[PDB]
Amino acid sequence: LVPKLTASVTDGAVGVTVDAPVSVTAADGVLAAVTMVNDNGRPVAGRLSPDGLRWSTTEQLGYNRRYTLNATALGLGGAATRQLTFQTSSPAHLTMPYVMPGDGEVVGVGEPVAIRFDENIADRGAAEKAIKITTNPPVEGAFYWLNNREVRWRPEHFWKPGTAVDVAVNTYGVDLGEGMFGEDNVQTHFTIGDEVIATADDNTKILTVRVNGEVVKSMPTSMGKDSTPTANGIYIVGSRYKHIIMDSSTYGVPVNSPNGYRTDVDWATQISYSGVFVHSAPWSVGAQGHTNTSHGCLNVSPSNAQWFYDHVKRGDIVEVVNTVGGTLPGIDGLGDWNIPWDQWRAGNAK
Ligand SMILES: *C(=O)/C=C\C(=O)Nc1ccc(Cl)cc1
Ligand code: NA
Ligand code: NA
170: CATH: 2.60.40.3710
**What are the two backbone dihedrals, phi and then psi, of residue 50, each rounded to the nearest 5 degrees?**
-55, -35
- Same domain (yes/no): 57, 181: no
Residues 315 and 207 in one domain: yes
- Does residue 289 form part of some domain? yes
Interatomic CA distance for residues 280 and 265, integer angstroms: 6
195 is in an annotated binding site: no
Q: In this structure, what DSSP letter does residue 43 have?
A: B
Q: 229 CB less than 6 Å from ligand 1?
A: no
Please tell me whether residues 334 and 211 are part of one structural domain.
yes
SS3 of 179-209: the string is CEEECCCEEEEEEECCCEEEEEECCCCEEEE
Ligand-binding annotation for 178, yes or no, is: yes
- In angstroms, rounded to a whole number, what is the distance separating the alpha carbons of residues 190 and 105? 5
Domain co-membership, 178 together with 242: no
Q: What residue type is 26 in one-letter code?
A: A
DSSP 88: B
Identify whether the C-beta of residue 344 lies closer than 8 Å to the C-beta of residue 144.
yes
Query: Could you tell me where the beta strands, DSSP code E, fall in 28-78?
Result: 30-37, 46-48, 54-57, 66-74
Tell me, yes or no, whether 92 lies in a domain.
no
Asked whether residue 189 falls in the same domain as residue 202, the answer is: no
Separation of alpha carbons 197 and 214, rounded Å: 10
Cα–ligand 2 centroid distance for 69 (angstroms): 12
190 plus 202 within the same structural domain: no
Which residue minimizes the CA distance to atom 8 of ligand 1?
295
CA-nearest residue, atom 5 of ligand 1: 246
Which residue lies with its CA nearest to atom 10 of ligand 1?
Answer: 263
Residues 159 and 262 placed together within one structural domain of the fold: no
Q: Residue 311 in 3-state DSSP?
A: helix
Three-class DSSP category at 74: strand
In terms of DSSP H, where are the helices of the chain?
A: 124-129, 302-311, 341-346
Measured in whole angstroms, the distance separating CA 189 from the mean position of its chain's CA atoms is 11
Report yes or no: 29 and 73 within 8 Å, Cβ to Cβ: yes
Catalytic residue positions, numbered: 279, 297
Q: What span, in angstroms and rounded, lies between the C-alpha atoms of 268 and 241?
A: 5
Q: Which experimental technique did the depositors report for determining this structure? A: X-ray
Check whether residue 249 and residue 285 sit in a common domain. Answer: yes
In 62-204, where do the E strands start and end? 66-74, 79-87, 93-95, 97-100, 106-107, 113-117, 131-136, 141-145, 150-155, 164-169, 180-182, 186-192, 196-201
* Same domain? 221 vs 323: yes
Side-chain-side CA neighbours of 69 within 13 Å: the count stands at 28
For residues 208 and 324, membership in a common domain is answered with yes
Same domain, 15 and 139: no
Task: Provide the residue range defining the domain that includes 109.
Answer: 97-194+340-346
Q: Does residue 296's CB lie within 6 angstroms of at least one atom of ligand 1?
A: yes
Q: What CATH number should be reported for the domain holding residue 258?
A: 2.40.440.10
Tell me, in angstroms, the distance from the centre of ligand 2 to residue 120's CA. Answer: 28
Query: Which of 51, 86, 121 is the C-terminal boundary of a domain?
Result: 86
Give how far the C-alpha of residue 66 lies from the chain's centroid of Cα atoms, to the nearest Å.
33
Instruction: Measure the CA–CA gap between 350 and 347, rounded to whole angstroms.
Output: 8
What is the Å distance from ligand 3's center to 247 Cα? 4
Choosing from 45, 67, 86, the residue where a domain stops is 86
Query: In this structure, are residues 168 and 103 in contact, taking their beta carbons and an 8 Å threshold?
Result: no
The whole-angstrom separation of Cα 242 and Cα 280 is: 10
Q: Answer with the one of 86, 119, 145 that is the final residue of a domain.
A: 86
* Ligand 1 mean position, distance from CA 244 (Å): 11
50: left (phi > 0), else alpha (psi -120 to 50), else beta? alpha
On whether residue 91 sits in a domain, the answer given is no
Indicate if the alpha-carbon torsion angle 149, 129, 63, 43 is positive or negative: positive
Q: How many domains does the chain have?
A: 3
Amino acid making up residue 264: D
To the question of whether residue 29 is assigned a binding role by annotation, the answer is: no
Spatial contact of 314 and 238, defined as CB atoms under 8 Å apart: yes
Q: Are strands 277-280 and 298-300 parallel, antiparallel or unpaired?
A: parallel
Distance CA 347, CA 33 (A): 49
Which one of 265, 270, 273, 298 would you pick to mutate in the ligand 1 pocket, going by the greatest count of ligand atoms within 8 A of its CB? 265
Ligand 1 probe mutation, 297, 300, 334, most atoms within 8 A of CB = 297
The C-alpha atoms of residue 48 and residue 52 are separated, in whole angstroms, by: 6
299 assigned to a ligand binding site = yes
> Coil, strand, or helix at residue 148?
coil
